[PDB]
Write a protein that binds this ligand. Structure first.
Ligand code: TMP
Ligand code: TMP
Ligand code: NA
Ligand code: NA
Lengths: 246, 246
């Protein structure tokens, strides 16, 4: 039994209610947010609010395939957000290709693939992204990057592979869209690798379940929530939005 | 906004449905289980099925206060389960007092207390129990102890301190009852320590939210589920149970 969770549509609704309520909490940067504490839902759409950007996602995936911990190695011009959280030397913590494909984080992908190839029913098929020393590593050399993804667990049931994603913190607009594309790519690769190992397995991709301690919208994206609250459209250009949260 | 989750009562219901359905999955030990994948609920009662045992809980808490990684240091006679998962030398991984009070796991309690004493609104107040090297450490010296608790996050909102518990795996009957008593003790201590630091804070304990990749019942406890399914009583002695799952 997979848990019958909220869907992306219902998360949209609860965010709209928080905004209507004026239930604000002060970000570390001083900015207001709206927040769901302890959120859990099935990721049945590839975005919550906003639009897709295959070009950027493909650049972030090439960076993950390189496993580099330096933001300059992102193909093309590196985004400003990555520059602002990096150390004095351009270093970060959150390269998810490093987290799952590097020997330095204990070969999470290959060990999860070996565990499930040996025991398809296991509860120990997991890729652990964060680490206890994060209590001190988050601000090494002046960076500001406390890992947001804690763990991802994989469970094979009825010839489908399901993923359970646990995050400390996730931005609804950019974070969720990029992080979802990545989790789906990893899931499909794992399915294909298991199938090439044994042509009788015939596995397929299953569901992705999303769990978050603080799932939040920054006040700079309140307009998307408000517009969806009024119209049902999940995207509008900032230039075209008319409404209070300009 | 805390997420409006299932309660313990509703978890009881879904477990009863899995049992009725005969939706079984094979444990590593060969035994059948029933399972909810990706479960998330508020812990508003101190047990799901079964009875309380303050004596045993108090012994496990004294062991946690000692921080010892050896099962013999549990006060009095050490339980058989702890003996069966221990290494050739009596060693385990899962002492939660070690995980949060030892310098060797990077002082999780003291660093979370310092983070929240400095910024009550933070999203980085977390105690990280597991670690990436668990892909290799789970069977060190022949033990069988892949850490079950991944992380616990603390969020202070409206002068109440809420906890978000993330677990890979949890047994509904013994695991949940013992693990809940522990999480509530830590929460109350944190509240009291914050209040003694500043007599204007006046904080109080809030909600505990429980998230689990595989939340399961072993076939040896199917009787409790069945009895509750038939009668609404959350406990019965194994001697008194009449029914199929004898
Ligand atoms: C690196 C990363 C950051 N974030 C966002 C979540 C938070 O808004 C922010 C981290 O801020 P915090 O460490 O104060 O929670 O970055 C994601 O949503 N996904 C990611 O993968
Ligand atoms: C140490 C510990 C184990 N357990 C149970 C969960 C599983 O039934 C078992 C670990 O088995 P697994 O590693 O194969 O999932 O021990 C808890 O529920 N809580 C705990 O704190
Ligand atoms: Na670049
Ligand atoms: Na003992």
């Amino acid at each position: 039994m997979i848990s019958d969770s909220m869907t992306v549509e219902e998360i949209r609704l609860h965010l709209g209610l928080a905004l209507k309520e004026k239930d604000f909490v002060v970000d570390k940067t001083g900015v207001k947010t709206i927040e769901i504490i302890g959120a859990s839902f099935v990721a049945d759409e590839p975005f919550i609010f906003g639009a897709l950007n295959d070009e950027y996602i493909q650049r972030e995936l090439e960076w993950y395939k390189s496993k580099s911990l330096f933001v300059k190695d992102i193909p093309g011009e590196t985004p400003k957000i990555w520059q602002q959280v990096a150390s004095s030397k351009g270093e970060i913590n959150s390269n998810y290709g490093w987290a799952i494909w590097s020997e330095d984080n204990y070969a999470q992908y290959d060990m999860c693939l070996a565990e499930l190839g040996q025991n398809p029913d296991s509860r120990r098929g997991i890729m652990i992204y964060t680490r206890p020393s994060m209590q001190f590593d988050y601000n090494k050399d002046g960076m500001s990057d406390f890992m947001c993804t804690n763990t991802v667990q994989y469970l094979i049931r009825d010839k489908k592979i399901n993923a359970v994603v646990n995050m400390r913190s996730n931005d609804v607009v950019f974070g969720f869209r990029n992080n979802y594309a990545w989790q789906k790519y990893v899931l499909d690769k794992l399915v294909s690798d298991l199938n090439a190992g044994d042509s009788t397995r015939q596995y397929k991709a299953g569901s992705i379940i999303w769990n978050v301690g603080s799932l939040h919208v920054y006040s700079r994206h309140f307009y998307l929530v408000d517009h969806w609250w009024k119209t049902g459209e999940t995207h509008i250009s900032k230039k075209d939005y008319v409404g209070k949260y300009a």
